[PDB]
Amino acid sequence: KTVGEALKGRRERLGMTLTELEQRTGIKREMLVHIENNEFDQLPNKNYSEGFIRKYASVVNIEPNQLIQAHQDEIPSNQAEW
Ligand SMILES: [Zn+2]
Numbered sequence: 001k002t003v004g005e006a007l008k009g010r011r012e013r014l015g016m017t018l019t020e021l022e023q024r025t026g027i028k029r030e031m032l033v034h035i036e037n038n039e040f041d042q043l044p045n046k047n048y049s050e051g052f053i054r055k056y057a058s059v060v061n062i063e064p065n066q067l068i069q070a071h072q073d074e075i076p077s078n079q080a081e082w
Helices: 003-013 018-025 029-036 046-059 064-070
Strands: none
Touching (some): 003 029, 003 046, 003 064, 018 029, 029 046, 046 064
């Protein structure tokens, strides 16, 4: 599975709507759907990809670091170079 499928799957098993997840995470539904679909290039700031995944994961009781590690080649890391 992709990271977005892992997250969405968990959300659906919890019976949690996107509306609820936006409330709990503070991440707008558009961006939550982009994450669920691995559409990281559609985030205004792609550097936030990991942080968005982390907040999602924490709300749905997925341990974030090991999720990120298992999917690291999918996830744009924070390009905080300069
Ligand atoms: Zn968009």
